[PDB]
Amino acid sequence: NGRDSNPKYLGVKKFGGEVVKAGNILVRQRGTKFKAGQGVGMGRDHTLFALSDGKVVFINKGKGARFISIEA
RNA sequence: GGAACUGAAACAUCUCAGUACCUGAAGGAGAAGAAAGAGAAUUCGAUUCCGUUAGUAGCGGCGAGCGAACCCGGAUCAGCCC
RNA sequence: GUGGACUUACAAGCAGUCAUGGCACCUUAUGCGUGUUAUGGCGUGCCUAUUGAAGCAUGAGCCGGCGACUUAGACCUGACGUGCGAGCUUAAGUUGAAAAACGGAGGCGGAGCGAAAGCGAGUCCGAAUAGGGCGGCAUUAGUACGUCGGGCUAGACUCGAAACCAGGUGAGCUAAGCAUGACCAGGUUGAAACCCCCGGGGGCGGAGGACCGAACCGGUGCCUGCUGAAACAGUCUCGGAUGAGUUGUGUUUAGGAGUGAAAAGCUAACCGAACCUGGAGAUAGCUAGUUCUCCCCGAAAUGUAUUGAGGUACAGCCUCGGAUGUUGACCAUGUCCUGUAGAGCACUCACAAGGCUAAAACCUUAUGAAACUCCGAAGGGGCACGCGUUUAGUCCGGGAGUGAGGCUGCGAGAGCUAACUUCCGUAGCCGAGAGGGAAACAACCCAGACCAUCAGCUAAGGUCCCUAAAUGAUCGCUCAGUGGUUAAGGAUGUGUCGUCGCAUAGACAGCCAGGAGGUUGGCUUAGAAGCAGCCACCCUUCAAAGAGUGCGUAAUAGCUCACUGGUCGAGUGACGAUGCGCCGAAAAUGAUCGGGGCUCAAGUGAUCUACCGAAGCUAUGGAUUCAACUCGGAGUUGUCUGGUAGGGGAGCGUU
RNA sequence: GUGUCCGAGUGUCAAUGCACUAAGGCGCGCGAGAGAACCCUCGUUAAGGAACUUUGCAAUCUCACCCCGUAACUUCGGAAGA
RNA sequence: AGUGGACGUAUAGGGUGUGACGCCUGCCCGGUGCCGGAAGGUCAAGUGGAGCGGUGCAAGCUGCGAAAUGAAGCCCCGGUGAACGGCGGCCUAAGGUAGCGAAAUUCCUUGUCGGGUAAGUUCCGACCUGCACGAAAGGCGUAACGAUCUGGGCGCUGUCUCAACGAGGGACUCGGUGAAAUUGAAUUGGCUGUAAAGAUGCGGCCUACCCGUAGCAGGACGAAAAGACCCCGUGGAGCUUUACUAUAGUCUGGCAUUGGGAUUCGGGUUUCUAGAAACUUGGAUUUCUAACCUGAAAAAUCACUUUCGGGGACCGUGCUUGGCGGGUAGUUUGACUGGGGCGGUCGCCUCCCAAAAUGUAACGGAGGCGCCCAAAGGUCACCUCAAGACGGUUGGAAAUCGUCUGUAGAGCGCAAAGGUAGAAGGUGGCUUGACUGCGAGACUGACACGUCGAGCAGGGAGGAAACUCGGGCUUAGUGAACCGGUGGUACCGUGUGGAAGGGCCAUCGAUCAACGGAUAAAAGUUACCCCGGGGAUAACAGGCUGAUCUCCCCCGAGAGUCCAUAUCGGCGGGGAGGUUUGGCACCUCGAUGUCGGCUCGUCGCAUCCUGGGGCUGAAGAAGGUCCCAAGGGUUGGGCUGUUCGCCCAUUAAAGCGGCACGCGAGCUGGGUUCAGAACGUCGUGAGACAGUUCGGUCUCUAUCCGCUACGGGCGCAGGAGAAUUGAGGGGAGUUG
RNA sequence: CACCCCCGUGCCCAUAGCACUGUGGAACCACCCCACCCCAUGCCGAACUGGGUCGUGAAACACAGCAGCGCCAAUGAUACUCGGACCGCAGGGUCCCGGAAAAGUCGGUCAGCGCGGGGGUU
Numbered sequence A: 001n002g003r004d005s006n007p008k009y010l011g012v013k014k015f016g017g018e019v020v021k022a023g024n025i026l027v028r029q030r031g032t033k034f035k036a037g038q039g040v041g042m043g044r045d046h047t048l049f050a051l052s053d054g055k056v057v058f059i060n061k062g063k064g065a066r067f068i069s070i071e072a
Numbered sequence B: 001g002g003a004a005c006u007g008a009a010a011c012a013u014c015u016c017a018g019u020a021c022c023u024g025a026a027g028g029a030g031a032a033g034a035a036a037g038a039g040a041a042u043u044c045g046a047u048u049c050c051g052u053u054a055g056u057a058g059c060g061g062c063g064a065g066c067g068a069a070c071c072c073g074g075a076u077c078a079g080c081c082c
Numbered sequence C: 001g002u003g004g005a006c007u008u009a010c011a012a013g014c015a016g017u018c019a020u021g022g023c024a025c026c027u028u029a030u031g032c033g034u035g036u037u038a039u040g041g042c043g044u045g046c047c048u049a050u051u052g053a054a055g056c057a058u059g060a061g062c063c064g065g066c067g068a069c070u071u072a073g074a075c076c077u078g079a080c081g082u083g084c085g086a087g088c089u090u091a092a093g094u095u096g097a098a099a100a101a102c103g104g105a106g107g108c109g110g111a112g113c114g115a116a117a118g119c120g121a122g123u124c125c126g127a128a129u130a131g132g133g134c135g136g137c138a139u140u141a142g143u144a145c146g147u148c149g150g151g152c153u154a155g156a157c158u159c160g161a162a163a164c165c166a167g168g169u170g171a172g173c174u175a176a177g178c179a180u181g182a183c184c185a186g187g188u189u190g191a192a193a194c195c196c197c198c199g200g201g202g203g204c205g206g207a208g209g210a211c212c213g214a215a216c217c218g219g220u221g222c223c224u225g226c227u228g229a230a231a232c233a234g235u236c237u238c239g240g241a242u243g244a245g246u247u248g249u250g251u252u253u254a255g256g257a258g259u260g261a262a263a264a265g266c267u268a269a270c271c272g273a274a275c276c277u278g279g280a281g282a283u284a285g286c287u288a289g290u291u292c293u294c295c296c297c298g299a300a301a302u303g304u305a306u307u308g309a310g311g312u313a314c315a316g317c318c319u320c321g322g323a324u325g326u327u328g329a330c331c332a333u334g335u336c337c338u339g340u341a342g343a344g345c346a347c348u349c350a351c352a353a354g355g356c357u358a359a360a361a362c363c364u365u366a367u368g369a370a371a372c373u374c375c376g377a378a379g380g381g382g383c384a385c386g387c388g389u390u391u392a393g394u395c396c397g398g399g400a401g402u403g404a405g406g407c408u409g410c411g412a413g414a415g416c417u418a419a420c421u422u423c424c425g426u427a428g429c430c431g432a433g434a435g436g437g438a439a440a441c442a443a444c445c446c447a448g449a450c451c452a453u454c455a456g457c458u459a460a461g462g463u464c465c466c467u468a469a470a471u472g473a474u475c476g477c478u479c480a481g482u483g484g485u486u487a488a489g490g491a492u493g494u495g496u497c498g499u500c501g502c503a504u505a506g507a508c509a510g511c512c513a514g515g516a517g518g519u520u521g522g523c524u525u526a527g528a529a530g531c532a533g534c535c536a537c538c539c540u541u542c543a544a545a546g547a548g549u550g551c552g553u554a555a556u557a558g559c560u561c562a563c564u565g566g567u568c569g570a571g572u573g574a575c576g577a578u579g580c581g582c583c584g585a586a587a588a589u590g591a592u593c594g595g596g597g598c599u600c601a602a603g604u605g606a607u608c609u610a611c612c613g614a615a616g617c618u619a620u621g622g623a624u625u626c627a628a629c630u631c632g633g634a635g636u637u638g639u640c641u642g643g644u645a646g647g648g649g650a651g652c653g654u655u
Numbered sequence D: 001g002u003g004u005c006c007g008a009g010u011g012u013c014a015a016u017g018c019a020c021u022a023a024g025g026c027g028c029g030c031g032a033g034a035g036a037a038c039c040c041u042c043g044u045u046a047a048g049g050a051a052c053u054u055u056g057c058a059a060u061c062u063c064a065c066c067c068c069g070u071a072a073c074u075u076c077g078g079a080a081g082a
Numbered sequence E: 001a002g003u004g005g006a007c008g009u010a011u012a013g014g015g016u017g018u019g020a021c022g023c024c025u026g027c028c029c030g031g032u033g034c035c036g037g038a039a040g041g042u043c044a045a046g047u048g049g050a051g052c053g054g055u056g057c058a059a060g061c062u063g064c065g066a067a068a069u070g071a072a073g074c075c076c077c078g079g080u081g082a083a084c085g086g087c088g089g090c091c092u093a094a095g096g097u098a099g100c101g102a103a104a105u106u107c108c109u110u111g112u113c114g115g116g117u118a119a120g121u122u123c124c125g126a127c128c129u130g131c132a133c134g135a136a137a138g139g140c141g142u143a144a145c146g147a148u149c150u151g152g153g154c155g156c157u158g159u160c161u162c163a164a165c166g167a168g169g170g171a172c173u174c175g176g177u178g179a180a181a182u183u184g185a186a187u188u189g190g191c192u193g194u195a196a197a198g199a200u201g202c203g204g205c206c207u208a209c210c211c212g213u214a215g216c217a218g219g220a221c222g223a224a225a226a227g228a229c230c231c232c233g234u235g236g237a238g239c240u241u242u243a244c245u246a247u248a249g250u251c252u253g254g255c256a257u258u259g260g261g262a263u264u265c266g267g268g269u270u271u272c273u274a275g276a277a278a279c280u281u282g283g284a285u286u287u288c289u290a291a292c293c294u295g296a297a298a299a300a301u302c303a304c305u306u307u308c309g310g311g312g313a314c315c316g317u318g319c320u321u322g323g324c325g326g327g328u329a330g331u332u333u334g335a336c337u338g339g340g341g342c343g344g345u346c347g348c349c350u351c352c353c354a355a356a357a358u359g360u361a362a363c364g365g366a367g368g369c370g371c372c373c374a375a376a377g378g379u380c381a382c383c384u385c386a387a388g389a390c391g392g393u394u395g396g397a398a399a400u401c402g403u404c405u406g407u408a409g410a411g412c413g414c415a416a417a418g419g420u421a422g423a424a425g426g427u428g429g430c431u432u433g434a435c436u437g438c439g440a441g442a443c444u445g446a447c448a449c450g451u452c453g454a455g456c457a458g459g460g461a462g463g464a465a466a467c468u469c470g471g472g473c474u475u476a477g478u479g480a481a482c483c484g485g486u487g488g489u490a491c492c493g494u495g496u497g498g499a500a501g502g503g504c505c506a507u508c509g510a511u512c513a514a515c516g517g518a519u520a521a522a523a524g525u526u527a528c529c530c531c532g533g534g535g536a537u538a539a540c541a542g543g544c545u546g547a548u549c550u551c552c553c554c555c556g557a558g559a560g561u562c563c564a565u566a567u568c569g570g571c572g573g574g575g576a577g578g579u580u581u582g583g584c585a586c587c588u589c590g591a592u593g594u595c596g597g598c599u600c601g602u603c604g605c606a607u608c609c610u611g612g613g614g615c616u617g618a619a620g621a622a623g624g625u626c627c628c629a630a631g632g633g634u635u636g637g638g639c640u641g642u643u644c645g646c647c648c649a650u651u652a653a654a655g656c657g658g659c660a661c662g663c664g665a666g667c668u669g670g671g672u673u674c675a676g677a678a679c680g681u682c683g684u685g686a687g688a689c690a691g692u693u694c695g696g697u698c699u700c701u702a703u704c705c706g707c708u709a710c711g712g713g714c715g716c717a718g719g720a721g722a723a724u725u726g727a728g729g730g731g732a733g734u735u736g
Numbered sequence F: 001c002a003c004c005c006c007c008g009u010g011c012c013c014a015u016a017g018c019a020c021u022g023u024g025g026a027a028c029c030a031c032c033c034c035a036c037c038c039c040a041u042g043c044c045g046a047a048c049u050g051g052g053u054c055g056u057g058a059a060a061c062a063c064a065g066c067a068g069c070g071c072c073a074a075u076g077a078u079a080c081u082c083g084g085a086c087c088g089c090a091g092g093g094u095c096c097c098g099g100a101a102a103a104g105u106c107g108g109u110c111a112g113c114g115c116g117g118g119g120g121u122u
């Protein structure tokens, strides 16, 4: 063994209560650990970036049912 | 005739360098010199030396690095003979 | 070395430091004196290299004197200063020189974008519109010098290679050759050939890389010699000693070359490539060394990359200046994100007793999990505020160094739940840190040294003597020197509670009294009969006794026992929690808690004071760094001043 | 260390060997005491005899000439100074 | 040029290896070498120049440029071993002929038996199981020879038990001369602790009047040479080869020196009734003598002439071609690494570690990638998976159909984590958005790279539309830079116009996988080693730890007929000691000498003897085992360098360990570890192994402390002679 | 939001879901109804789908009861932990302050809010 692979510094890049420019990246994820609410659009590797400038808010009933909206 | 350390963080091309060194000829100097040229204005008008153009052009395992010439400004300026 | 003051012969000692006393002296000098001295306290040379230095790590005998960050250039870059300023200035040279002027060729600013053609405050990409660099805007003014910080290139802070190359010098040592001369006492052995008697005997003869042994040539073994008598020898012993011998002279062969009966041996006393001069101050990522003083700030041993790992590049951290202007920082509120501790089996692996059944499955019950999660804190990170105390931050430009870390505690891995082990996270100390405590001691506990005082309160730690300070006070605890070195395990050790029995209808040991019944009980080997031993315990006679405890020879008896009794006269026996202790408990020169000594506490657990105790804090005096505040550095108030690499600043000494 | 030449006598089979000595030459350019440990070159050693030690390393022992006598083996010479 | 070979000429000369003599010298031509062959494969310059292009109005000039034809040489085919070699592993070209064998070769190894000694790791003779013999890198013998090595025996010895006495030269004392290595400074003790972990110098405690002198050799990690061992340096040098690169040399084709001619000519021209005389441009054999080379004659080397003689247009030399070329030369030969080597690893992806942010090391625990898919894409539309039970045709535990349960227990191309049921899974229709030009904004990184990305243009594709498309559910499927190939484009293109060449856009070439990548192009070896450094880093020793080692204790199964504990103690548990093999890497690489012996010793006690005990399965005696006990004592020899162990023969007994595995400024020097050499084994080679074997320099001068002796001074309240008490210190201590 | 009830479509986002179950009927919805063709089944008008009444509330669906199941879930007490401060050689553990789960019990629920329309009491 003695093998390993680079860190992928994934996360909630922008936490609810953070104003965001358009195109800011807010969550990094392997998949849909977050499912993108209103105003946000999710990319190829399933990072989801805000489309509209404003505050970031978490809709989060959880269990795969967590969504990131942006409010203007 | 012609190095090698060395640099290239190794090392062959490269550089170190036509350096050091050996050998020949000669003088108070020597060399060179009177355009089958530079050059791009149909200009220049022998040779040598300084400043500059200029680290420009360019050369380079296009790497380390190596590097002009013309224009222009001065020092000195004689062209003579087969 | 000579002479004089003071001193020195039970003293333990980085050579001193402060203090006190004794003696001597009085020319910056009768003092807050100079020389010396006794005693007391205190006290790990210096530098370097270091995680860490008194080190038993390096360097150094001592004093002097030489001795290391330079110079260069029409170079690049920055800070400061000066002239001129939208412009600024020369170079080569020329003419003068006890003096400098002329000299515009040329350089820099003025426009940028593009790969370039080329356009031009626009420009490249492109088919038009999205960008990049750029001007407007802040038009940030440049340039010639001087000084200085850096950079470059050249020996480039100084010393130091082993090597490489060039042209020479060497065969007078030694390695061989050639020419030519010379030397080898003496004794032993007796080949051929030649000649007689029958290959053999005799004679005769004088051969040999033959024998012994002097010179001579050579070095076999011990010893001596080992700052030698000698830079390879000496005594003694040994090899050869007519041969492949020794030796003179003259002479030839040499540097990757010669010579070599072959060791890489010899080539002028260091030959796996001589010597000398030179290239040449070769290179040196390696070592050591780098000197005057004071002020201010102050690190790093981390990340990634590397023919990289002990070295470099770029970040990270330091400093100086400019700008900005609280953006910092801690703490609080609000919010969001997380899958650890824990905890759980709901999936995956595992796994514990059963029921159920052609056992997978299934149910009751029961568990572990870094790569399991139905769950899931504490904390932690981002944002916003400041609803609150503070002073840092950000970018831009010059200079750095650091890129070897060390411990402890917490959390993990690796290891053996070893290591003053190795590798990460994290906090603090050390590095770079002085002062008090811990006998001693970078890391631990206390506490960050501006200077001066024969002033005060305290921290940790202490208060019997060493040794500063209560032989303090009160309730105990341990009689072990435990204190002042572990454990599994044992113990009628001792206090504190605490759970279970049987007693003035009289029990525990304690003395006499009885020990019974089938039954010499079934089941066993050869006999096993309270009393080897696998299987099973009911029944009679009794105020009274279990087919019944350990012993006994191999089996029964035998003295005791569990209930019974006259006596006996009052508590006992059991497992338990614990507090302090005992054993368990052997290592190497001589013992010990730092020592004395401590229970007639100087141990201990609980409380409470009173004081000692630091370079921390307070007092008086004093000076720097900064900043405000005033007058044309000064002074006030506040504040700050441990320090390695390093950066900055003010100054002293020499020619 | 250094090449060549001459290098007497007594005795001893011989000799340039060994011992004494002629000629000739010299006592080695600090001395004098003293008679410890220890060290170097030496002499003798009870009893034992290799026990020593890596090894009999070293030190003994053997010693010249003459007579007698000498093996396994042999390349017929030698081993043999058995 | 000239020389040596050689004033020699195959019975001679050169090289290579074996190494008198004797009997001998087997197998294997596959690779490598070499010698022959030379049907065919390939192969340079040169001869040829068909065609492809520029540039000019054109003549023409000019850049490329095939086919065929071109030597040696290599591929191919034989052979060669007294050529390099090979003759073994429960198919290779073959597999060991004789001879020998525990060897100079034997690891296991002190092999087994015999011999010799009281005792034999040695030695000798047999045996053979030859790790890992062997036939001219020669095998088996051999008389004689050896300062050769090994084993034995005689002889004699101070080698020794065990040393003594004597001599001389030192050594000591006096007078004369009078150095040296060294040296931080010294007012320089013992223990025990502590500190970088070995203290004179830090702590406590003990001891110690001042100073010498003769001695010793424990300490001062004493002295000496900035470790020759080990590691490091993008140090060096010597040596090696099928590392790389060149190259003296060497072979080969063509051109010149270099020529007439006959002879066969694939061909040239004007020549003539498909044709041949003048003639060749050449090639080819063959031949010739004026070039040239060489030799003989009074004129030695050289020149002349030569009645001359031989070779001969070759040989030699100049240029150029291609091959051979460790002989020479200049170099390359990676890093991490709980010391180097060996093994492993080097880039990207997934998980745990990673301590609920991101991040985080390890030669830590697990596994994947160097691709795929014309549809596994875009879009539009449509389906729902495991698994179980009941029932069923050839099948039955599981084909297939049928019902019931069925937030998933399936699937998602490969590894896993996330994710997913309104799909990313499955199945069709259409087509390519697997587009060109851009990139607001962020994530991430020191850079450089990397990730995601709304929306705009041109234009597509699917859908009725909203809308979705600039690749795949996601995360791996990858390499800057240089130098070049291919297609466009029309920017530079040196006087001008063109073109040659260059630039740009697209694309191709990389286990450069040591994966940020030194060159286009590179392996070993050093023990002949050299330099510079490192205690940054191994071998020793000390330290820390104590797995392993040594010891004790608890339990108690059983053994002990019986009876656990007289003894012994399974399977398990707890400690101690630091003597073993270690780990770790802390002081020491400007030096800490290392194994064994010898000489001196001293300490522990886990006690071999001796002394005092308890229990005993103790009658007695001899024992067993445990307790207390460290005063003393603990033998001599054979084997091996040994420690050890075995053995002889005795003992009261033949103790175990510490003290740098105590002791080399005390001694040896056998072992091991420098240069020579040989054997086996490994390597083609230089060379190599902690396998073996012979051999191989151990440095007169003691300052200090410390130790044994011997004085000087002073002290001890007068100055003196002599006798003394013993504080307190040593020696002795055994036993049959 | 007059009272109910139906069809649909949201918010919510198992305290709403399952099962047992009962009411429902031409009003709404639902099956049945037929198929050459629109349109379709990798076979079937089962599914889409196109043409409709009867019939029937069977099934599905809506709505009520329902605490067997699931779903939620205290308090209390712990586990753990931020800071402080300690002991044990060690594995380990204690104390002060404050934050504080998970599991279980107690107990809670078969929901809760809109919007448009259709038909009822005519």
Ligand SMILES: CC[C@H]1OC(=O)/C=C/[C@H](C)[C@@H](O[C@@H]2O[C@H](C)C[C@H](N(C)C)[C@H]2O)[C@@H](C)C[C@@H](C)C(=O)/C=C/C=C/[C@@H]1CO[C@@H]1O[C@H](C)[C@@H](O)[C@@H](OC)[C@H]1OC
Residues within 6 Å of the ligand: C226, C231, C232, E224, E225, E591, E593, E699
């Ligand atoms: C004193 C006797 C000899 O001693 C020696 O040969 C002594 C040498 C000593 C022992 C050596 O040092 C040791 O080196 C070991 C590798 C390590 C060791 N310890 C510390 C770990 C260390 O001690 C040598 C190499 C050390 C130094 C001093 C050195 O190189 C000495 C050279 C000269 C020494 C001496 C020289 O002897 C020469 O011998 C010739 C035979 C004589 O003729 C003569 O030559 C002229 C003589 O001198 C050179």
Ligand SMILES: [Mg+2]
Residues within 6 Å of the ligand: A001, A002
């Ligand atoms: Mg591993």
Ligand SMILES: [Mg+2]
Residues within 6 Å of the ligand: B007, B008
């Ligand atoms: Mg270089």
Ligand SMILES: [Mg+2]
Residues within 6 Å of the ligand: none
């Ligand atoms: Mg070079």
Ligand SMILES: [Mg+2]
Residues within 6 Å of the ligand: none
């Ligand atoms: Mg010159």
Ligand SMILES: [Mg+2]
Residues within 6 Å of the ligand: none
């Ligand atoms: Mg000259």
Ligand SMILES: [Mg+2]
Residues within 6 Å of the ligand: none
């Ligand atoms: Mg001249």
Ligand SMILES: [Mg+2]
Residues within 6 Å of the ligand: none
């Ligand atoms: Mg006194």
Ligand SMILES: [Mg+2]
Residues within 6 Å of the ligand: none
């Ligand atoms: Mg003293």
Ligand SMILES: [Mg+2]
Residues within 6 Å of the ligand: C044
């Ligand atoms: Mg100090």
Ligand SMILES: [Mg+2]
Residues within 6 Å of the ligand: none
């Ligand atoms: Mg160190």
Ligand SMILES: [Mg+2]
Residues within 6 Å of the ligand: none
């Ligand atoms: Mg020192």
Ligand SMILES: [Mg+2]
Residues within 6 Å of the ligand: none
């Ligand atoms: Mg020294």
Ligand SMILES: [Mg+2]
Residues within 6 Å of the ligand: none
């Ligand atoms: Mg110039």
Ligand SMILES: [Mg+2]
Residues within 6 Å of the ligand: none
């Ligand atoms: Mg300025």
Ligand SMILES: [Mg+2]
Residues within 6 Å of the ligand: none
């Ligand atoms: Mg701008």
